[PDB]
């Protein structure tokens, strides 16, 4: 226990040497299991104008246990709640050691491009997205401008 598992070391290195387009991820010098992550809002989505800040933590049992992640940037989305908690299959019961941090980050990026208000696990924002999709998307765009970091 005097060293970080090689898998975390290698995944961390690879997140730097082979970054995912639109995504940045780096650990804190004082806690190598705690990551600062940013994800660009997908082009043509209601979130296209901003960059979102997230935090990620690798628990002691990773990779048997899934990484924990959440959005720090306030966002209006049917699968990300008011505290930034993310409803994603691979972060829950469907996580497995065959998956990796990159899988999770790509999945979150895709979730921003494709919100799913019809998921049985969607949050309370879902009703607005189903009954007034145009207004819900306008609010998500408005909140991107108000709360996310601006893109160049």
């Amino acid at each position: 226990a005097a060293s970080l598992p090689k898998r975390i070391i290698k995944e961390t290195e690879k997140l730097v040497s082979d970054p995912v387009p639109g995504i940045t991820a780096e650990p804190h010098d004082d806690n190598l299991r705690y990551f600062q992550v940013t994800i660009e809002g997908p082009e043509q989505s209601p979130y296209e104008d901003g960059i979102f800040e997230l935090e990620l933590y690798l628990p002691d049992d990773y990779p048997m246990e899934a990484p924990k992640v959440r959005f720090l940037t306030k966002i209006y989305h049917p699968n990300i709640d008011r505290l930034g908690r993310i409803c994603l299959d691979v972060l829950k019961t469907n996580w497995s050691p065959a998956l990796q941090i990159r899988t999770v980050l790509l999945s979150i990026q895709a979730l921003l491009a494709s919100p799913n208000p019809n998921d049985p696990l969607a949050n309370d924002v879902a009703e607005d997205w189903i009954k007034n999709e145009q207004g819900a998307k306008a609010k998500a765009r408005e909140w991107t401008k108000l709360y996310a970091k601006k893109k160049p």
Partner: protein, 132 residues
Amino acid sequence: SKVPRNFRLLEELEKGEKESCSYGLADSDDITMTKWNGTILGPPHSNHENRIYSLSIDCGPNYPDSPPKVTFISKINLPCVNPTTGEVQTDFHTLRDWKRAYTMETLLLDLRKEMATPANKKLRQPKEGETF
């Protein structure tokens, strides 16, 4: 091995979302998860029986390395609670000997236990419903 503040609070939140004490966020959209509301049901065999106490808990920037600040909203006659402000005094053992492993659950349970010590259980309480 050190769980960051934000994820430790997310852990306590989940546990609080799912019987003598409870707590939850004071503001459902407070992303920093700083202010919490807590409730303690008075212990049996005491002047606290059948009473429900509301409290405010503040988990600051250094929580859980530093203990949270706890203040009773519901009025209570208990020695470790400042009788004017409702603030739980720093000398209370849980706060005095705070360990990173301790949680808001630990604190609420310890305060309920304090309500039941022979000397504290016989103290006369304020009229039901009064606040500090």
